[PDB]
Amino acid sequence: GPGDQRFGDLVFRQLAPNVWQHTSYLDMPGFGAVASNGLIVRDGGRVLVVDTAWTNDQTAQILNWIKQEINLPVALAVVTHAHQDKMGGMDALHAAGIATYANALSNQLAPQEGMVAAQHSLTFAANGWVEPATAPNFGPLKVFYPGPGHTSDNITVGIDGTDIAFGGCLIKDSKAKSLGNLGDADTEHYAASARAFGAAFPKASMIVMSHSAPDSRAAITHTARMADKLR
Ligand SMILES: [Co+2]
Ligand code: NI
Ligand code: NI
Ligand code: NI
Ligand code: NI
Ligand SMILES: [Zn+2]
């Protein structure tokens, strides 16, 4: 094969014939450089983005990479929760004229989290699945709210026609020593949420997450086990 492509300050790794993982890095004091992962999906004739990079400039570099390597318009972008690593680059999307979507609760939280709100709000049915009327032209993206975990507003996405499911920062890999930043976490409902995500995408084999390489379903089980210790 061919190695993961370096473009600007970013790294792109193709997970499927129409799916790529974009990675951006931010220096955290004494922690070294921290990677944050999102996704890029090619649907027929347009591109779909999941999550921004840490910053606007990094997010602009993503759009440049798409123009160079895919050359299709970015129809929309969905962000998974109101934290810098997922919504830090909203202005870059808006400057490019891209319709952005986020959980309604994420947009509510954006000001207190110091984030720019998305332009459109997603609402989810009682069973967790997004109400289609609020998510037009999402194509293969299946959006699902598993409940409060990493944050109160974290959502997850599965890509129809693939074995991929993106858990975002809700899920950690199968050997993570902790659930990381629990500043805005719901310790009570966390465990139940990770298990809901797994049940929502029962056939997904490649689990993509924010802070490590794609893992198996062992990531879901392992994350839930760690979450049980919080309640
Ligand atoms: Co900004
Ligand atoms: Ni609009
Ligand atoms: Ni409904
Ligand atoms: Ni409860
Ligand atoms: Ni384990
Ligand atoms: Zn977060």
PDB file of C-alpha atoms and ligand atoms in Angstrom:
ATOM      1  CA  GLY A   1       0.000   0.000   0.000  1.00  0.00           C
ATOM      2  CA  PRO A   2       0.859   3.712   0.520  1.00  0.00           C
ATOM      3  CA  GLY A   3       1.569   5.535   3.778  1.00  0.00           C
ATOM      4  CA  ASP A   4      -0.660   8.033   5.557  1.00  0.00           C
ATOM      5  CA  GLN A   5      -0.508  11.338   3.689  1.00  0.00           C
ATOM      6  CA  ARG A   6       1.016  14.400   5.328  1.00  0.00           C
ATOM      7  CA  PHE A   7      -0.534  17.681   4.178  1.00  0.00           C
ATOM      8  CA  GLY A   8       0.387  20.898   5.955  1.00  0.00           C
ATOM      9  CA  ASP A   9       0.224  20.227   9.691  1.00  0.00           C
ATOM     10  CA  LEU A  10      -2.323  17.430   9.248  1.00  0.00           C
ATOM     11  CA  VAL A  11      -2.326  13.687   8.587  1.00  0.00           C
ATOM     12  CA  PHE A  12      -4.864  11.833   6.439  1.00  0.00           C
ATOM     13  CA  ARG A  13      -5.385   8.064   6.625  1.00  0.00           C
ATOM     14  CA  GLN A  14      -7.771   6.342   4.217  1.00  0.00           C
ATOM     15  CA  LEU A  15      -9.994   3.826   6.017  1.00  0.00           C
ATOM     16  CA  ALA A  16     -12.125   2.893   3.004  1.00  0.00           C
ATOM     17  CA  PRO A  17     -12.473   3.691  -0.729  1.00  0.00           C
ATOM     18  CA  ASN A  18     -14.631   6.704   0.220  1.00  0.00           C
ATOM     19  CA  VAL A  19     -13.636   7.352   3.845  1.00  0.00           C
ATOM     20  CA  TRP A  20     -10.605   9.163   5.269  1.00  0.00           C
ATOM     21  CA  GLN A  21      -9.557  10.083   8.807  1.00  0.00           C
ATOM     22  CA  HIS A  22      -8.193  13.605   9.240  1.00  0.00           C
ATOM     23  CA  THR A  23      -5.861  14.234  12.181  1.00  0.00           C
ATOM     24  CA  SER A  24      -4.748  17.540  13.709  1.00  0.00           C
ATOM     25  CA  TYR A  25      -2.332  18.230  16.564  1.00  0.00           C
ATOM     26  CA  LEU A  26      -2.261  20.682  19.466  1.00  0.00           C
ATOM     27  CA  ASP A  27       0.570  21.091  21.963  1.00  0.00           C
ATOM     28  CA  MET A  28      -0.622  20.387  25.501  1.00  0.00           C
ATOM     29  CA  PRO A  29       1.964  21.423  28.179  1.00  0.00           C
ATOM     30  CA  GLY A  30       4.182  18.483  29.107  1.00  0.00           C
ATOM     31  CA  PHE A  31       1.782  16.083  27.406  1.00  0.00           C
ATOM     32  CA  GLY A  32       3.490  16.388  24.029  1.00  0.00           C
ATOM     33  CA  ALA A  33       1.403  16.855  20.889  1.00  0.00           C
ATOM     34  CA  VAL A  34      -2.188  15.615  21.202  1.00  0.00           C
ATOM     35  CA  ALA A  35      -3.864  14.180  18.109  1.00  0.00           C
ATOM     36  CA  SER A  36      -7.560  14.718  17.379  1.00  0.00           C
ATOM     37  CA  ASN A  37      -9.355  12.641  14.744  1.00  0.00           C
ATOM     38  CA  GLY A  38     -12.355  13.253  12.503  1.00  0.00           C
ATOM     39  CA  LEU A  39     -13.681  11.814   9.238  1.00  0.00           C
ATOM     40  CA  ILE A  40     -14.093  12.768   5.584  1.00  0.00           C
ATOM     41  CA  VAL A  41     -16.704  10.946   3.492  1.00  0.00           C
ATOM     42  CA  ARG A  42     -17.140  11.006  -0.292  1.00  0.00           C
ATOM     43  CA  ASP A  43     -20.800  10.585  -1.241  1.00  0.00           C
ATOM     44  CA  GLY A  44     -21.444  10.311  -4.877  1.00  0.00           C
ATOM     45  CA  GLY A  45     -20.548  13.811  -5.919  1.00  0.00           C
ATOM     46  CA  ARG A  46     -20.012  15.740  -2.710  1.00  0.00           C
ATOM     47  CA  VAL A  47     -17.899  15.553   0.443  1.00  0.00           C
ATOM     48  CA  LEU A  48     -19.145  15.219   4.018  1.00  0.00           C
ATOM     49  CA  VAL A  49     -17.013  16.170   7.031  1.00  0.00           C
ATOM     50  CA  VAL A  50     -17.283  14.874  10.590  1.00  0.00           C
ATOM     51  CA  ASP A  51     -15.747  17.227  13.181  1.00  0.00           C
ATOM     52  CA  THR A  52     -13.348  20.133  12.681  1.00  0.00           C
ATOM     53  CA  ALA A  53      -9.696  20.346  13.709  1.00  0.00           C
ATOM     54  CA  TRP A  54      -8.421  22.097  16.849  1.00  0.00           C
ATOM     55  CA  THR A  55      -8.250  25.485  15.100  1.00  0.00           C
ATOM     56  CA  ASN A  56      -9.654  27.420  12.135  1.00  0.00           C
ATOM     57  CA  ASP A  57      -6.367  27.357  10.233  1.00  0.00           C
ATOM     58  CA  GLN A  58      -6.016  23.589  10.598  1.00  0.00           C
ATOM     59  CA  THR A  59      -9.634  23.271   9.498  1.00  0.00           C
ATOM     60  CA  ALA A  60      -8.895  25.412   6.443  1.00  0.00           C
ATOM     61  CA  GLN A  61      -6.064  23.017   5.596  1.00  0.00           C
ATOM     62  CA  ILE A  62      -8.550  20.140   5.668  1.00  0.00           C
ATOM     63  CA  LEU A  63     -10.686  21.930   3.076  1.00  0.00           C
ATOM     64  CA  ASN A  64      -7.604  22.512   0.914  1.00  0.00           C
ATOM     65  CA  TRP A  65      -6.702  18.822   1.095  1.00  0.00           C
ATOM     66  CA  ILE A  66     -10.232  17.913  -0.008  1.00  0.00           C
ATOM     67  CA  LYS A  67      -9.976  20.295  -2.966  1.00  0.00           C
ATOM     68  CA  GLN A  68      -6.634  18.823  -4.024  1.00  0.00           C
ATOM     69  CA  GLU A  69      -7.257  15.107  -3.496  1.00  0.00           C
ATOM     70  CA  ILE A  70     -11.019  14.737  -4.070  1.00  0.00           C
ATOM     71  CA  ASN A  71     -12.135  17.917  -5.851  1.00  0.00           C
ATOM     72  CA  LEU A  72     -15.796  17.776  -4.832  1.00  0.00           C
ATOM     73  CA  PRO A  73     -17.851  20.368  -2.932  1.00  0.00           C
ATOM     74  CA  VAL A  74     -18.205  19.916   0.827  1.00  0.00           C
ATOM     75  CA  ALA A  75     -21.992  19.681   1.103  1.00  0.00           C
ATOM     76  CA  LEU A  76     -22.088  19.808   4.904  1.00  0.00           C
ATOM     77  CA  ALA A  77     -20.268  19.182   8.172  1.00  0.00           C
ATOM     78  CA  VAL A  78     -21.408  17.624  11.447  1.00  0.00           C
ATOM     79  CA  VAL A  79     -19.626  18.178  14.770  1.00  0.00           C
ATOM     80  CA  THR A  80     -20.018  15.705  17.626  1.00  0.00           C
ATOM     81  CA  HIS A  81     -19.797  17.956  20.712  1.00  0.00           C
ATOM     82  CA  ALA A  82     -18.895  21.415  22.013  1.00  0.00           C
ATOM     83  CA  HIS A  83     -15.176  21.134  22.759  1.00  0.00           C
ATOM     84  CA  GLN A  84     -12.207  22.752  21.000  1.00  0.00           C
ATOM     85  CA  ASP A  85     -10.950  19.562  19.376  1.00  0.00           C
ATOM     86  CA  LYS A  86     -14.294  18.996  17.609  1.00  0.00           C
ATOM     87  CA  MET A  87     -15.703  22.522  17.167  1.00  0.00           C
ATOM     88  CA  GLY A  88     -12.623  24.733  17.366  1.00  0.00           C
ATOM     89  CA  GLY A  89     -12.629  25.305  13.613  1.00  0.00           C
ATOM     90  CA  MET A  90     -16.230  26.309  12.901  1.00  0.00           C
ATOM     91  CA  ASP A  91     -15.383  29.763  11.528  1.00  0.00           C
ATOM     92  CA  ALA A  92     -13.287  28.159   8.781  1.00  0.00           C
ATOM     93  CA  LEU A  93     -16.261  26.073   7.653  1.00  0.00           C
ATOM     94  CA  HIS A  94     -18.602  29.065   7.754  1.00  0.00           C
ATOM     95  CA  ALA A  95     -16.100  31.204   5.844  1.00  0.00           C
ATOM     96  CA  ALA A  96     -16.117  28.510   3.148  1.00  0.00           C
ATOM     97  CA  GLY A  97     -19.920  28.586   2.944  1.00  0.00           C
ATOM     98  CA  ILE A  98     -20.417  25.081   4.330  1.00  0.00           C
ATOM     99  CA  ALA A  99     -23.662  24.216   6.114  1.00  0.00           C
ATOM    100  CA  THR A 100     -22.771  22.999   9.610  1.00  0.00           C
ATOM    101  CA  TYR A 101     -24.809  20.765  11.926  1.00  0.00           C
ATOM    102  CA  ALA A 102     -24.542  19.916  15.618  1.00  0.00           C
ATOM    103  CA  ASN A 103     -26.670  18.550  18.441  1.00  0.00           C
ATOM    104  CA  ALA A 104     -29.152  21.190  19.585  1.00  0.00           C
ATOM    105  CA  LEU A 105     -27.611  20.845  23.039  1.00  0.00           C
ATOM    106  CA  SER A 106     -24.137  21.437  21.589  1.00  0.00           C
ATOM    107  CA  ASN A 107     -25.223  24.776  20.130  1.00  0.00           C
ATOM    108  CA  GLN A 108     -26.693  25.690  23.524  1.00  0.00           C
ATOM    109  CA  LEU A 109     -23.403  24.792  25.203  1.00  0.00           C
ATOM    110  CA  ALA A 110     -21.180  26.506  22.632  1.00  0.00           C
ATOM    111  CA  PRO A 111     -21.021  29.936  24.338  1.00  0.00           C
ATOM    112  CA  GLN A 112     -20.087  28.638  27.806  1.00  0.00           C
ATOM    113  CA  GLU A 113     -17.570  26.269  26.194  1.00  0.00           C
ATOM    114  CA  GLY A 114     -16.098  29.145  24.187  1.00  0.00           C
ATOM    115  CA  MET A 115     -17.151  27.546  20.903  1.00  0.00           C
ATOM    116  CA  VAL A 116     -18.868  28.960  17.833  1.00  0.00           C
ATOM    117  CA  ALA A 117     -22.277  27.339  17.406  1.00  0.00           C
ATOM    118  CA  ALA A 118     -23.140  25.424  14.245  1.00  0.00           C
ATOM    119  CA  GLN A 119     -25.678  26.983  11.869  1.00  0.00           C
ATOM    120  CA  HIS A 120     -28.262  24.198  12.202  1.00  0.00           C
ATOM    121  CA  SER A 121     -29.455  22.114  15.157  1.00  0.00           C
ATOM    122  CA  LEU A 122     -30.050  18.362  15.180  1.00  0.00           C
ATOM    123  CA  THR A 123     -32.903  16.906  17.230  1.00  0.00           C
ATOM    124  CA  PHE A 124     -33.071  13.232  18.199  1.00  0.00           C
ATOM    125  CA  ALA A 125     -36.047  10.926  18.692  1.00  0.00           C
ATOM    126  CA  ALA A 126     -36.676   9.101  21.969  1.00  0.00           C
ATOM    127  CA  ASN A 127     -34.798   6.028  20.720  1.00  0.00           C
ATOM    128  CA  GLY A 128     -31.672   8.115  20.114  1.00  0.00           C
ATOM    129  CA  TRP A 129     -31.735   8.336  16.321  1.00  0.00           C
ATOM    130  CA  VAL A 130     -31.738  11.781  14.720  1.00  0.00           C
ATOM    131  CA  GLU A 131     -35.089  13.048  13.436  1.00  0.00           C
ATOM    132  CA  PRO A 132     -34.575  13.032   9.625  1.00  0.00           C
ATOM    133  CA  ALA A 133     -36.321  16.393   9.146  1.00  0.00           C
ATOM    134  CA  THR A 134     -33.440  18.112  10.965  1.00  0.00           C
ATOM    135  CA  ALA A 135     -30.690  16.269   9.061  1.00  0.00           C
ATOM    136  CA  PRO A 136     -31.251  16.843   5.319  1.00  0.00           C
ATOM    137  CA  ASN A 137     -28.879  15.394   2.710  1.00  0.00           C
ATOM    138  CA  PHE A 138     -26.897  13.437   5.317  1.00  0.00           C
ATOM    139  CA  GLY A 139     -26.706  10.475   2.936  1.00  0.00           C
ATOM    140  CA  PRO A 140     -24.774   7.526   4.401  1.00  0.00           C
ATOM    141  CA  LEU A 141     -24.203   9.313   7.730  1.00  0.00           C
ATOM    142  CA  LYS A 142     -26.331   7.722  10.454  1.00  0.00           C
ATOM    143  CA  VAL A 143     -26.343  10.028  13.478  1.00  0.00           C
ATOM    144  CA  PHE A 144     -27.213   8.707  16.938  1.00  0.00           C
ATOM    145  CA  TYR A 145     -27.332  10.243  20.419  1.00  0.00           C
ATOM    146  CA  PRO A 146     -26.277   7.518  22.893  1.00  0.00           C
ATOM    147  CA  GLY A 147     -26.940   9.653  25.974  1.00  0.00           C
ATOM    148  CA  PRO A 148     -24.710  11.687  28.315  1.00  0.00           C
ATOM    149  CA  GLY A 149     -21.144  10.405  28.698  1.00  0.00           C
ATOM    150  CA  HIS A 150     -17.976  12.333  27.868  1.00  0.00           C
ATOM    151  CA  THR A 151     -20.312  15.320  27.702  1.00  0.00           C
ATOM    152  CA  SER A 152     -24.064  15.871  27.956  1.00  0.00           C
ATOM    153  CA  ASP A 153     -24.244  16.549  24.219  1.00  0.00           C
ATOM    154  CA  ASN A 154     -21.906  13.970  22.663  1.00  0.00           C
ATOM    155  CA  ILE A 155     -23.273  12.280  19.542  1.00  0.00           C
ATOM    156  CA  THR A 156     -22.002   9.456  17.342  1.00  0.00           C
ATOM    157  CA  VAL A 157     -21.997   8.666  13.628  1.00  0.00           C
ATOM    158  CA  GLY A 158     -22.023   5.511  11.523  1.00  0.00           C
ATOM    159  CA  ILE A 159     -21.238   5.344   7.809  1.00  0.00           C
ATOM    160  CA  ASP A 160     -23.743   3.308   5.805  1.00  0.00           C
ATOM    161  CA  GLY A 161     -22.127   0.930   3.321  1.00  0.00           C
ATOM    162  CA  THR A 162     -19.053   0.442   5.511  1.00  0.00           C
ATOM    163  CA  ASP A 163     -17.968  -1.323   8.704  1.00  0.00           C
ATOM    164  CA  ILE A 164     -17.125   2.008  10.343  1.00  0.00           C
ATOM    165  CA  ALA A 165     -18.645   3.749  13.356  1.00  0.00           C
ATOM    166  CA  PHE A 166     -17.297   6.972  14.868  1.00  0.00           C
ATOM    167  CA  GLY A 167     -17.710   7.213  18.637  1.00  0.00           C
ATOM    168  CA  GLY A 168     -15.802  10.469  19.003  1.00  0.00           C
ATOM    169  CA  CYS A 169     -14.492  11.237  22.486  1.00  0.00           C
ATOM    170  CA  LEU A 170     -17.112   9.042  24.155  1.00  0.00           C
ATOM    171  CA  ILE A 171     -15.031   5.970  23.304  1.00  0.00           C
ATOM    172  CA  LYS A 172     -11.403   5.221  24.187  1.00  0.00           C
ATOM    173  CA  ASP A 173      -9.237   2.438  22.750  1.00  0.00           C
ATOM    174  CA  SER A 174      -9.066  -1.062  24.207  1.00  0.00           C
ATOM    175  CA  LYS A 175      -6.050  -0.333  26.453  1.00  0.00           C
ATOM    176  CA  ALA A 176      -6.729   3.240  27.585  1.00  0.00           C
ATOM    177  CA  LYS A 177      -5.745   3.718  31.230  1.00  0.00           C
ATOM    178  CA  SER A 178      -8.514   6.250  31.889  1.00  0.00           C
ATOM    179  CA  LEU A 179     -11.502   8.041  30.359  1.00  0.00           C
ATOM    180  CA  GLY A 180      -9.403  11.195  30.026  1.00  0.00           C
ATOM    181  CA  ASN A 181     -10.969  14.623  30.473  1.00  0.00           C
ATOM    182  CA  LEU A 182     -14.039  14.210  32.688  1.00  0.00           C
ATOM    183  CA  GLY A 183     -14.585  17.934  33.209  1.00  0.00           C
ATOM    184  CA  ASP A 184     -18.053  17.934  31.651  1.00  0.00           C
ATOM    185  CA  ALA A 185     -18.720  14.200  31.971  1.00  0.00           C
ATOM    186  CA  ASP A 186     -21.890  12.548  33.271  1.00  0.00           C
ATOM    187  CA  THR A 187     -20.328   9.875  35.482  1.00  0.00           C
ATOM    188  CA  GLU A 188     -23.725   8.341  36.265  1.00  0.00           C
ATOM    189  CA  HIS A 189     -24.948   7.629  32.727  1.00  0.00           C
ATOM    190  CA  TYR A 190     -21.545   7.254  31.036  1.00  0.00           C
ATOM    191  CA  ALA A 191     -21.411   3.445  31.068  1.00  0.00           C
ATOM    192  CA  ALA A 192     -24.944   3.051  29.703  1.00  0.00           C
ATOM    193  CA  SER A 193     -24.156   5.512  26.907  1.00  0.00           C
ATOM    194  CA  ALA A 194     -21.122   3.655  25.549  1.00  0.00           C
ATOM    195  CA  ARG A 195     -23.144   0.434  25.502  1.00  0.00           C
ATOM    196  CA  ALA A 196     -25.966   2.214  23.669  1.00  0.00           C
ATOM    197  CA  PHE A 197     -23.515   3.321  20.980  1.00  0.00           C
ATOM    198  CA  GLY A 198     -22.426  -0.283  20.510  1.00  0.00           C
ATOM    199  CA  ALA A 199     -26.009  -1.509  20.253  1.00  0.00           C
ATOM    200  CA  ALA A 200     -26.852   1.261  17.776  1.00  0.00           C
ATOM    201  CA  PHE A 201     -24.146   0.049  15.382  1.00  0.00           C
ATOM    202  CA  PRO A 202     -24.067  -3.698  16.189  1.00  0.00           C
ATOM    203  CA  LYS A 203     -22.341  -4.700  12.932  1.00  0.00           C
ATOM    204  CA  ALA A 204     -19.590  -2.060  12.970  1.00  0.00           C
ATOM    205  CA  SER A 205     -16.147  -3.669  13.288  1.00  0.00           C
ATOM    206  CA  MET A 206     -13.848  -0.654  12.887  1.00  0.00           C
ATOM    207  CA  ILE A 207     -14.431   1.816  15.716  1.00  0.00           C
ATOM    208  CA  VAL A 208     -12.993   5.270  15.042  1.00  0.00           C
ATOM    209  CA  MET A 209     -12.338   7.606  17.969  1.00  0.00           C
ATOM    210  CA  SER A 210     -10.911  11.055  18.631  1.00  0.00           C
ATOM    211  CA  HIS A 211      -7.567  10.310  20.302  1.00  0.00           C
ATOM    212  CA  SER A 212      -6.130   7.094  18.874  1.00  0.00           C
ATOM    213  CA  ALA A 213      -5.990   4.841  15.828  1.00  0.00           C
ATOM    214  CA  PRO A 214      -9.156   2.936  14.826  1.00  0.00           C
ATOM    215  CA  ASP A 215      -9.791  -0.094  17.051  1.00  0.00           C
ATOM    216  CA  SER A 216     -12.119  -3.099  17.239  1.00  0.00           C
ATOM    217  CA  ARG A 217     -15.334  -3.415  19.244  1.00  0.00           C
ATOM    218  CA  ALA A 218     -13.050  -4.181  22.197  1.00  0.00           C
ATOM    219  CA  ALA A 219     -12.782  -0.403  22.554  1.00  0.00           C
ATOM    220  CA  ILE A 220     -16.509  -0.170  23.314  1.00  0.00           C
ATOM    221  CA  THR A 221     -16.423  -2.979  25.878  1.00  0.00           C
ATOM    222  CA  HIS A 222     -13.258  -1.664  27.522  1.00  0.00           C
ATOM    223  CA  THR A 223     -14.601   1.900  27.691  1.00  0.00           C
ATOM    224  CA  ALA A 224     -17.835   0.695  29.287  1.00  0.00           C
ATOM    225  CA  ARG A 225     -15.889  -1.297  31.885  1.00  0.00           C
ATOM    226  CA  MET A 226     -13.912   1.796  32.883  1.00  0.00           C
ATOM    227  CA  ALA A 227     -17.137   3.809  32.984  1.00  0.00           C
ATOM    228  CA  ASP A 228     -18.751   1.359  35.421  1.00  0.00           C
ATOM    229  CA  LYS A 229     -16.140   2.383  37.992  1.00  0.00           C
ATOM    230  CA  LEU A 230     -17.493   5.953  38.010  1.00  0.00           C
ATOM    231  CA  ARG A 231     -20.935   5.089  39.400  1.00  0.00           C
TER     232      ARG A 231
HETATM  233 CO    CO B   1     -12.804  30.505  15.533  1.00  0.00          CO
HETATM  234 NI    NI B   2     -29.378  26.863   6.537  1.00  0.00          NI
HETATM  235 NI    NI B   3     -39.702  11.524  15.500  1.00  0.00          NI
HETATM  236 NI    NI B   4     -30.708   8.625  34.775  1.00  0.00          NI
HETATM  237 NI    NI B   5     -10.233  -4.056  28.879  1.00  0.00          NI
HETATM  238 ZN    ZN B   6     -14.598  16.661  24.458  1.00  0.00          ZN
END
